[PDB]
Design a protein around this motif. Structure first.
Motif, PDB file in Angstrom:
ATOM      1  N   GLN A  41      -5.277   4.288  -6.922  1.00  0.00           N
ATOM      2  CA  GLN A  41      -5.280   3.197  -7.876  1.00  0.00           C
ATOM      3  C   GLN A  41      -6.355   2.176  -7.547  1.00  0.00           C
ATOM      4  O   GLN A  41      -6.752   1.999  -6.387  1.00  0.00           O
ATOM      5  CB  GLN A  41      -3.910   2.506  -7.897  1.00  0.00           C
ATOM      6  CG  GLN A  41      -2.780   3.440  -8.221  1.00  0.00           C
ATOM      7  CD  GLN A  41      -1.426   2.802  -8.089  1.00  0.00           C
ATOM      8  OE1 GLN A  41      -1.121   1.824  -8.766  1.00  0.00           O
ATOM      9  NE2 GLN A  41      -0.604   3.348  -7.201  1.00  0.00           N
ATOM     10  N   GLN A  47       0.851  -1.173   0.000  1.00  0.00           N
ATOM     11  CA  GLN A  47       0.000   0.000   0.000  1.00  0.00           C
ATOM     12  C   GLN A  47       0.895   1.233   0.000  1.00  0.00           C
ATOM     13  O   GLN A  47       2.030   1.186   0.495  1.00  0.00           O
ATOM     14  CB  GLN A  47      -0.893   0.006   1.242  1.00  0.00           C
ATOM     15  CG  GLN A  47      -2.019  -1.021   1.217  1.00  0.00           C
ATOM     16  CD  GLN A  47      -3.277  -0.502   0.549  1.00  0.00           C
ATOM     17  OE1 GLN A  47      -3.897   0.462   1.022  1.00  0.00           O
ATOM     18  NE2 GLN A  47      -3.680  -1.157  -0.528  1.00  0.00           N
ATOM     19  N   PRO A  48       0.430   2.334  -0.586  1.00  0.00           N
ATOM     20  CA  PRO A  48       1.196   3.581  -0.537  1.00  0.00           C
ATOM     21  C   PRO A  48       1.174   4.160   0.865  1.00  0.00           C
ATOM     22  O   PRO A  48       0.147   4.138   1.544  1.00  0.00           O
ATOM     23  CB  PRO A  48       0.464   4.478  -1.535  1.00  0.00           C
ATOM     24  CG  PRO A  48      -0.981   4.009  -1.457  1.00  0.00           C
ATOM     25  CD  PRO A  48      -0.852   2.479  -1.302  1.00  0.00           C
ATOM     26  N   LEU A  90      -5.501  -4.358  -4.361  1.00  0.00           N
ATOM     27  CA  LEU A  90      -6.324  -3.611  -3.425  1.00  0.00           C
ATOM     28  C   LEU A  90      -6.503  -2.159  -3.879  1.00  0.00           C
ATOM     29  O   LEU A  90      -5.613  -1.573  -4.500  1.00  0.00           O
ATOM     30  CB  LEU A  90      -5.681  -3.635  -2.037  1.00  0.00           C
ATOM     31  CG  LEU A  90      -5.449  -5.011  -1.434  1.00  0.00           C
ATOM     32  CD1 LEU A  90      -4.869  -4.906  -0.050  1.00  0.00           C
ATOM     33  CD2 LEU A  90      -6.713  -5.875  -1.451  1.00  0.00           C
ATOM     34  N   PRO A  91      -7.598  -1.514  -3.506  1.00  0.00           N
ATOM     35  CA  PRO A  91      -7.638  -0.058  -3.652  1.00  0.00           C
ATOM     36  C   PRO A  91      -6.507   0.582  -2.875  1.00  0.00           C
ATOM     37  O   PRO A  91      -6.099   0.090  -1.817  1.00  0.00           O
ATOM     38  CB  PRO A  91      -9.002   0.337  -3.086  1.00  0.00           C
ATOM     39  CG  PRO A  91      -9.674  -0.889  -2.642  1.00  0.00           C
ATOM     40  CD  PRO A  91      -8.728  -2.041  -2.747  1.00  0.00           C
ATOM     41  N   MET A  92      -5.989   1.682  -3.427  1.00  0.00           N
ATOM     42  CA  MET A  92      -4.865   2.429  -2.879  1.00  0.00           C
ATOM     43  C   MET A  92      -5.223   3.899  -2.900  1.00  0.00           C
ATOM     44  O   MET A  92      -5.675   4.419  -3.932  1.00  0.00           O
ATOM     45  CB  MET A  92      -3.599   2.202  -3.718  1.00  0.00           C
ATOM     46  CG  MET A  92      -3.070   0.807  -3.583  1.00  0.00           C
ATOM     47  SD  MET A  92      -1.704   0.543  -4.722  1.00  0.00           S
ATOM     48  CE  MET A  92      -1.407  -1.210  -4.464  1.00  0.00           C
ATOM     49  N   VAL A  93      -5.012   4.559  -1.775  1.00  0.00           N
ATOM     50  CA  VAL A  93      -5.225   5.997  -1.644  1.00  0.00           C
ATOM     51  C   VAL A  93      -3.874   6.678  -1.460  1.00  0.00           C
ATOM     52  O   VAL A  93      -3.200   6.528  -0.429  1.00  0.00           O
ATOM     53  CB  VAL A  93      -6.167   6.329  -0.488  1.00  0.00           C
ATOM     54  CG1 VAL A  93      -6.335   7.818  -0.390  1.00  0.00           C
ATOM     55  CG2 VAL A  93      -7.516   5.640  -0.678  1.00  0.00           C
ATOM     56  N   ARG A 152      -9.816  -3.942   0.877  1.00  0.00           N
ATOM     57  CA  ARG A 152      -9.818  -2.549   1.315  1.00  0.00           C
ATOM     58  C   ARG A 152      -8.438  -1.906   1.343  1.00  0.00           C
ATOM     59  O   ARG A 152      -7.404  -2.574   1.424  1.00  0.00           O
ATOM     60  CB  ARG A 152     -10.493  -2.402   2.687  1.00  0.00           C
ATOM     61  CG  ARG A 152      -9.949  -3.210   3.841  1.00  0.00           C
ATOM     62  CD  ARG A 152     -10.717  -2.927   5.175  1.00  0.00           C
ATOM     63  NE  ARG A 152     -11.979  -3.661   5.299  1.00  0.00           N
ATOM     64  CZ  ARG A 152     -12.821  -3.560   6.324  1.00  0.00           C
ATOM     65  NH1 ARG A 152     -12.574  -2.766   7.353  1.00  0.00           N
ATOM     66  NH2 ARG A 152     -13.941  -4.272   6.317  1.00  0.00           N
ATOM     67  N   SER A 153      -8.441  -0.588   1.176  1.00  0.00           N
ATOM     68  CA  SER A 153      -7.223   0.167   1.384  1.00  0.00           C
ATOM     69  C   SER A 153      -6.933   0.202   2.883  1.00  0.00           C
ATOM     70  O   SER A 153      -7.813  -0.059   3.704  1.00  0.00           O
ATOM     71  CB  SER A 153      -7.375   1.590   0.863  1.00  0.00           C
ATOM     72  OG  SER A 153      -8.175   2.392   1.715  1.00  0.00           O
ATOM     73  N   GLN A 154      -5.691   0.551   3.234  1.00  0.00           N
ATOM     74  CA  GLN A 154      -5.364   0.878   4.609  1.00  0.00           C
ATOM     75  C   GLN A 154      -6.145   2.131   5.031  1.00  0.00           C
ATOM     76  O   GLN A 154      -6.626   2.916   4.192  1.00  0.00           O
ATOM     77  CB  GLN A 154      -3.849   1.046   4.787  1.00  0.00           C
ATOM     78  CG  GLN A 154      -3.252   2.292   4.216  1.00  0.00           C
ATOM     79  CD  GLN A 154      -1.756   2.334   4.429  1.00  0.00           C
ATOM     80  OE1 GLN A 154      -1.073   1.286   4.322  1.00  0.00           O
ATOM     81  NE2 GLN A 154      -1.232   3.524   4.752  1.00  0.00           N
ATOM     82  N   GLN A 202      -7.225   5.778   6.109  1.00  0.00           N
ATOM     83  CA  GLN A 202      -6.861   7.169   5.903  1.00  0.00           C
ATOM     84  C   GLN A 202      -7.414   7.956   7.085  1.00  0.00           C
ATOM     85  O   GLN A 202      -8.215   7.435   7.865  1.00  0.00           O
ATOM     86  CB  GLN A 202      -7.424   7.683   4.560  1.00  0.00           C
ATOM     87  CG  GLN A 202      -7.046   6.803   3.325  1.00  0.00           C
ATOM     88  CD  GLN A 202      -5.546   6.639   3.166  1.00  0.00           C
ATOM     89  OE1 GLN A 202      -4.808   7.613   3.008  1.00  0.00           O
ATOM     90  NE2 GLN A 202      -5.090   5.397   3.140  1.00  0.00           N
TER      91      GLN A 202
END
Ligand code: XS8
Ligand code: XS8
Lengths: 103, 102
Positions: B26, A94-95, B2-5, B92-94, B96
Motif C-alpha cells: 500500500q 505496519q503489516p 507510510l509505505p507498507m510491504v 519508510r516501511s519497516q 523487509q
C-alpha cells in the motif's frame, strides 16, 4: 499515535491456529483490534479474519492475541499471510508477517 | 500514511542481482524508492544501494523492483540484507528481509 508492532514472539503455526502470540509495541488499548489478512501478488484481498485479544492480560506495550484458524485447513504447502493492529477505523500499524503450515 | 510491504515474490537470489522482485502493498507512488541495506550486528550500516523501480508497471499496491547486484560477488556464504520502501525524505516501511547467495 498509530499502533506500532516492534516484535512478535511467534512467526508460524499449524493451520488450525488457536495458540497465543505476544506482540511487543506501543499505543495498544482495550479497543485495539488485530486483523489477519492475505493478498494475491496483484493485491486482491482473499482473506480477512479478526483475532481475539486477551484484554485482561494485555498492556499498552504488550498485546496477547489468539492466532486465527487459517482460511483453508487443507493447504498442502505453507502460506504467507499478514496481520495488523488497528485503533479506530483508520489508524493501522505496519503489516506484519506470519506463516501457516499444513497439518 | 507510510509505505507498507505485505508480500514479496522473491526472498533471495544470486549475487549477480538483476532479476525482478514484485512487492505487494500500500501507499506506493511514482516517487517511491526501494533501498537495500546491510548492517553489522553492532548496527553500523555497511551497505546502502537504491534499487531501480519500473515506474511504468508499478501501481499504488505493486512495486516492480530490479534486485541490485550485491556489493561483493566473491562471497562464499549467503548474506542476509534488508530493504525498505521510502516515500519522500523519511516516510519508510519497516525493514523487509532478503538473502544473496554465492
Ligand atoms: N488491560 C488493559 C489495560 C492496559 O492497557 C491495555 C492495552 C491493551 C488491552 F487490550 C488491554 C489493556
Ligand atoms: N505507474 C504509476 C501510477 C500508479 O501508481 C504508481 C505507484 C508506484 C509507481 F512506481 C508508479 C506508479
Amino acid at each position: 499515535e498509530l499502533p506500532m508492532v516492534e516484535r512478535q514472539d511467534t512467526d508460524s503455526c499449524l493451520v488450525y491456529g488457536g495458540q497465543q502470540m505476544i506482540l511487543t509495541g506501543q499505543n495498544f488499548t482495550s479497543e485495539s483490534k488485530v486483523v489477519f489478512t492475505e493478498k494475491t501478488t496483484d493485491g486482491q484481498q482473499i482473506w480477512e479474519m479478526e483475532a481475539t485479544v486477551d484484554k485482561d492480560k494485555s498492556q499498552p506495550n504488550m498485546l496477547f492475541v489468539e492466532i486465527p484458524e487459517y482460511r483453508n485447513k487443507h493447504i498442502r504447502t505453507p502460506v504467507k499471510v499478514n496481520f495488523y493492529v488497528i485503533n479506530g477505523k483508520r489508524k493501522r500499524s505496519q503489516p506484519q508477517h506470519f506463516t501457516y503450515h499444513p497439518v
